[PDB]
Amino acid sequence: SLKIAMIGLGDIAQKAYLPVLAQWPDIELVLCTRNPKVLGTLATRYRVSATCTDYRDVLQYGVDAVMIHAATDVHSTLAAFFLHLGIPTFVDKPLAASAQECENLYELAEKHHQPLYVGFNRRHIPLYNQHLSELAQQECGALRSLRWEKHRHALPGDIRTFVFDDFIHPLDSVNLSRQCNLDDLHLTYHMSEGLLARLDVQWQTGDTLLHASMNRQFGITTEHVTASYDNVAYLFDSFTQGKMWRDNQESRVALKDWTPMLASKGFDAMVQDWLQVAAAGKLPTHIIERNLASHQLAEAICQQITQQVTK
Amino acid sequence: SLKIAMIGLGDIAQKAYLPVLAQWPDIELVLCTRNPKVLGTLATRYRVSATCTDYRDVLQYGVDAVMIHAATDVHSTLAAFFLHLGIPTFVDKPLAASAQECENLYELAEKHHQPLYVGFNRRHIPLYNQHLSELAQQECGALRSLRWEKHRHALPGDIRTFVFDDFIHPLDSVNLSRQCNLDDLHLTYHMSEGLLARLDVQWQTGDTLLHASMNRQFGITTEHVTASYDNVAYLFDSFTQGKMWRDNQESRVALKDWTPMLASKGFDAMVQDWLQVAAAGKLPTHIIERNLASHQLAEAICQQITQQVTK
Amino acid sequence: SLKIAMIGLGDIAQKAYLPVLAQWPDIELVLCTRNPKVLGTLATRYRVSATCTDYRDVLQYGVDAVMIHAATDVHSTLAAFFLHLGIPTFVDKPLAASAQECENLYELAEKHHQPLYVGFNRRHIPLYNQHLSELAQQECGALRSLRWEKHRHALPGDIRTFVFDDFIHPLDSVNLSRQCNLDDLHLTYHMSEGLLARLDVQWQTGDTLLHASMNRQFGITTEHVTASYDNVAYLFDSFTQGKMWRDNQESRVALKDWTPMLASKGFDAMVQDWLQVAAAGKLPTHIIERNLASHQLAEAICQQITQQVTK
Amino acid sequence: SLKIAMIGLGDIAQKAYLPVLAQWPDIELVLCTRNPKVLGTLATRYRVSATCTDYRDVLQYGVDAVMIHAATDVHSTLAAFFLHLGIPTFVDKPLAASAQECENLYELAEKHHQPLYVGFNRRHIPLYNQHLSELAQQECGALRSLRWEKHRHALPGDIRTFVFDDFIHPLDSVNLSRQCNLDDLHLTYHMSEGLLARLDVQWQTGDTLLHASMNRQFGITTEHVTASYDNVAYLFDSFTQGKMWRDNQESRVALKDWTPMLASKGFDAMVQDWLQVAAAGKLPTHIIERNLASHQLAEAICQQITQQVTK
Ligand code: NI
């Protein structure tokens, strides 16, 4: 059995995590959030006796690990608190607001031999990891190309936020390699009256061309993933449907009916991994390098665009 | 009314060109090809009188212009010929096997003040030009991105052939900036057992990201075009259908029913542009520069992969 | 705030109802089922105190209503029981294996002035009722036609089960005219080996053509709904996606993102209506009549077939 | 070798027939039509020497067969003129304006022992006859169901024209059992502003449910064909593409690229047949029984509707 604390019950905590762990058997929750009104409503709805208003009062529940869903602003603070207190810590992307804080956090995590899992659901998409072993293995494998497009309609933003809070999803999902700088990388972008409209990062490591694309001034909000091997390719227009091309024939691949929405988006699968990491008390090295790399690449991309625009 | 001579009745000539001109009103055809058997077969099929076997006899019928559909290894020889004799010449892409010859040919055309039209049908695709005026205008306009993909199933080939006889399609089609080198351009490729499998070329001109992609070892033979502007986008999965995305809504855009197949592939629209060009003895400068640019770009790509591969 | 008791925790209960209710706000649950093993397993999973094995002890907790999810052959018993005790009763379709029982149960419920709600989730499909008001309001309105197709791959069965436990879905969903017989109705079917393979019931009410189609020996398992008005049509290939044809144009209509799976299948919407009814001790007349009619029609369909076959 | 005369060069003759027979090998044409202007233009455009302005000045060319593409009101007259003289005749749907006239023309046909081919391209569609052999053989076969929908956006009309000139297509295509009356058949329809808007004819012959529907007041103009066998089904949304459902999996079936438009709509295959019938002088029985049947069923459906709308 496992006991977990959830600090910061905001939009995502309520939209996905809570509903996923609330029904998860053999798991005991310890809800924590500053707003007592919200806290109580939720605790009652999902029948949770372990209530907490001050994240520090969590120590009084001997938890096996905590999950932080609060805003980025208070990520490190809360993360560092449980880490230097010898407690596994889960955190929603982005781990921190800057690459340096990400490095420091992981340093503290190592100085205490504690795991620091960063929530990246797009590494656990059931339909994608089913036809694409590479994504499940987090390697480049036999992939010849992989393009991850996540767009939005009329929704530009400031460089920083755009990259760390949104682009990081396609950027990390495609980061099957461990790209951490802009070396041998091709960064392109457009800007509409002061803001970032579309970002394109693409590079080739080995025999695999990785491409992360985000056009937030697109004609419609949608996310597509295209991957190709030798004489075989897939194109997913969503997380539940797709097309498989082989032998010059096209067929559709899809999740089985009744598969819950939060599962298709990979939260169920991710929590699974998280728990195993929490229980084992250790997160595999490549995952730690994956995490840092993606965050470092974000920083490189930000400073680069910022410098070019300002200059 | 014009009298056009067709030199070199091969595959493309029989499949597209010939059947299109033999339909055009006020046009007299003068078939010409090495093989006398094939000549007579077609001559009978399209009930044409003016038959010839030696391109030199073509002059006898007092032709108003010539259309060369022979192999690439004989374009220069045939083109130069009618150019010296001052006759508007048409040549099916590619113009020549190298940028050197192309440059010569055009220099030769300028000298004799004759038009030299290069057959690029993907600049006349009715459905695309109806929705992307930038293509009809052959400019970048408001385009924020334009991606042209032309894939094939299990069909790798040698650099030269692959680039000059296939990739030249998506490359030129996307080359609205008249690019003629690898300056600030990204080029990725993948060799397979001695052959070129996939080639990806993209660069940013002003506020437009151009991208030509060709995977000759794709899971299926298909050609997709994707264009985007601010808050507007399009994605065509063929020359007859496509999706339009605007106001965060997806609608379908398609070619009128009963549109002849060859017309959908822009052949009629091209022959029309060509006949006017020949009948006017003039060919706009921007078009000439595009032809030249696309060919020099192809040259640059070949003498890049070949060099690298041999290392 | 209501206290609902769920009697009979079978598959449908564990897959949709239980998960939706155990999450519903201001509702205390009282689980009840024969098997004490499953009873406790579920009770632990959804953290519920009010446990019970005999459908009688349920009255002890002073429930405001009961939801019977047991087998069809136990509905009448359970239903009648609480209906007499004067408690709003909910029963998952079908109400009973015969129209007679249905008529009895409703006649009974009318005496005790209690509401008897039947579980027809396909009447609360959020994406369908959002676009087609006729379905929301349960009328024919401007509908010139409505076709509900629900097919299965290689799954024939006996007339009874096929109709009362399956076909009733599409049949009822289309029964917007309260059809309670075979009057001016066209019934068609096919028997594979010794079972019912496909059934097709279609009739016309005024200016509306209704059609229920089920081919349980179809090449694939899917469900398509097609609705048409004057110069307007819709075709949904699922509960989340569909296309709209208007002004000779095709546009995509889809369910908002992050919508829970069960919700898209109209369960949340149905439970809502159910609770309101239960808390109001009243159930609109037009609803009851539709319920009876659909079961009376199912009865009629079963008979004419069984007869015509044995004949 | 063959020589065919074409009487009546309208829009269909110019859009489909002339072009198809213009490149046909071993076939000499004898263009005939009222209007002189049009005539010469076409004779020059397709380079035909055999000109004509009167369907009577036709035997001066010793034709082997004739093709009438004129209006319906002049079909009989012309059809009889050549069947008298003893000439294989080809007529475009509908054969005549009434079932009476059809039987008449067909009685005069066997009277002079001459074939009377009716142009029904929907029987010779390459993509459909490929996967659906029953349509190629023209018999119910193993089909369990076959639905042919042909809708139009905002285009209602008078019963007569709506039926014989348009509905005749789907009605005949699904008529594999030579249905000729309203026996055991289900007919529904809808009128609007005094015109016919939608028409649906459905009946079951053996183990095959055949359904023809046409809603000329649909949201878009499109034609769909659905066909189901035991545990197998096909859905064609066009004449060149479709979906094949088998083993609960969906795959795409389509026409090879570069297949001319007129070929996909079946004109090539039909003409092919038409010729093999003109040369052979004999037309298979079932084909004659089918054509009559379709026109008889057409009349039945007309008078039937005309009566109720009048009663
Ligand atoms: Ni409405």
Chain pair with largest interface? A-B, 37 and 36 residues
Question: How would you classify the quaternary structure?
Answer: homotetramer
Please name the fourth-level CATH homologous superfamily of the largest domain in chain A: Dihydrodipicolinate Reductase, domain 2
Number of helices of chain A: 10
Widest beta sheet: strand line-up of chain A? 8-9-10-7-11-12-13-14
- If you compute it from the alpha carbons, what radius of gyration of chain A comes out, rounded to the nearest whole angstrom? 20 Å
Order of helices and strands of chain A: EHEHEEHEHEHHEHEEEEEEEHHH
What does this protein look like?
The structure is a homotetramer of 311-residue chains. Chain A folds into 2 domains: 1-119, NAD(P)-binding Rossmann-like Domain (Rossmann fold); 120-311, Dihydrodipicolinate Reductase, domain 2, CATH 3.30.360.10. In chain A, 37% of the residues lie in helices and 27% in strands. Chain A is built from 10 helices and 14 strands. In chain A, the strands form 2 sheets. The first copy, chain A, has an 8-stranded mixed beta sheet with strand order 8-9-10-7-11-12-13-14. In chain A, strand 2, helix 2 and strand 3 form a beta-alpha-beta unit. In chain A, helix 3 (75-83) runs parallel beside helix 4, helix 4 runs antiparallel to helix 10 and helix 7 runs antiparallel to helix 10 (285-310). Chains in contact: A-B, A-C, A-D, B-C, B-D, C-D. Bound molecules: nickel (II) ion.
